[PDB]
Amino acid sequence: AQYEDGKQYTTLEKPVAGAPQVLEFFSFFCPHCYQFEEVLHISDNVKKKLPEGVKMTKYHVNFMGGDLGKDLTQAWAVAMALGVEDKVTVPLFEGVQKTQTIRSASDIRDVFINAGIKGEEYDAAWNSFVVKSLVAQQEKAAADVQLRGVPAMFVNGKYQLNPQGMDTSNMDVFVQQYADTVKYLSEK
Numbered sequence: 001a002q003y004e005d006g007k008q009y010t011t012l013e014k015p016v017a018g019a020p021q022v023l024e025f026f027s028f029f030c031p032h033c034y035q036f037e038e039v040l041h042i043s044d045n046v047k048k049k050l051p052e053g054v055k056m057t058k059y060h061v062n063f064m065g066g067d068l069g070k071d072l073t074q075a076w077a078v079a080m081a082l083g084v085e086d087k088v089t090v091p092l093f094e095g096v097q098k099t100q101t102i103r104s105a106s107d108i109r110d111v112f113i114n115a116g117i118k119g120e121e122y123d124a125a126w127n128s129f130v131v132k133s134l135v136a137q138q139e140k141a142a143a144d145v146q147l148r149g150v151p152a153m154f155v156n157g158k159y160q161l162n163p164q165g166m167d168t169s170n171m172d173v174f175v176q177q178y179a180d181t182v183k184y185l186s187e188k
Contacts, residue, residue, distance in 0.1 A: 007165045008181045012158050016144045019157025020057040022050065022182065025142060027063040028072050028096045030150045040175050042151075049179045050186060058085075059138040061150055065096075071105045072096075077134035078112070078125040081173055087115040155185040 005011050024043060026033040036042040047056055060076035062069050072092070079085045091111045095102035102108055112122045125131055145154055153161040166177045 003181065003184050007154075007162065009162050009185060010160045012145065012154075012160060014146075016154075019144070019154065020141070021054050021156055022046065022056045022186070023141065023145075023157070024056070024058040025061055025147060025150050025152040025154075026058065027061050027064040027069065027150050028092045028102075029069060031097065032043070033151045034093050034097050036151045037089060042175060042178060044152075045175050045179045046182045049183045051183070054186065057141075057143055061142055061147065062139065063148070065148070068096075068102070068108075071108055071139040073138055074126065074131065074135055075105075075108045075112070077131045077138065078122065080134055081125050081128070081131055082117060082121070083094030084112070084115065084117055087117075088112055091115065121182070152186060153182065155182060155188075159185045159188070162187075 001010070026036070028042075030152075043056065043058060052054070060073040062073050065072065075088075076085075076093070079088050088111055092102070092108070092115070095107065095111055102111070109122060113119060145157070145160075151163075161178065161181060163174075163178060166174055166181075168174050
């Protein structure tokens, strides 16, 4: 075959019912994730090739960066609740990995303030039970699927993208291969 289990993707032994259609996991501490977001624009290029009627979900994970990793998962929950994912993703990545100016929850908060979210509004989101269940969702989805590494993508709770088995000589060729795989898996 051209697409083979164990080559461009692996199959979950233990499939996850009711899972989001396209599910991505990342961490702001994760170096390949930085690349995926800033250099490759993976999420975006996958979306451009997905059939439509397809919804795309992205969650943060706790297992990198100890205490700040958790803060970052709660902040990503705030971002999702406020619909400001596209305004904070880049400065969070660069704050954590490039400039290293994010060292505390208050520094994470600064990024949202600088992106124009209001103090009252951030602190209210931060502390809301709607954000608590969104944190719960992020953790449950990761727990359901065996998650020990990022970046990670799952399709319909049964297939996991396997970028290790795609050519990396060319960054553009890698992305298309990656996205076409998602679409193949999607139509499976």
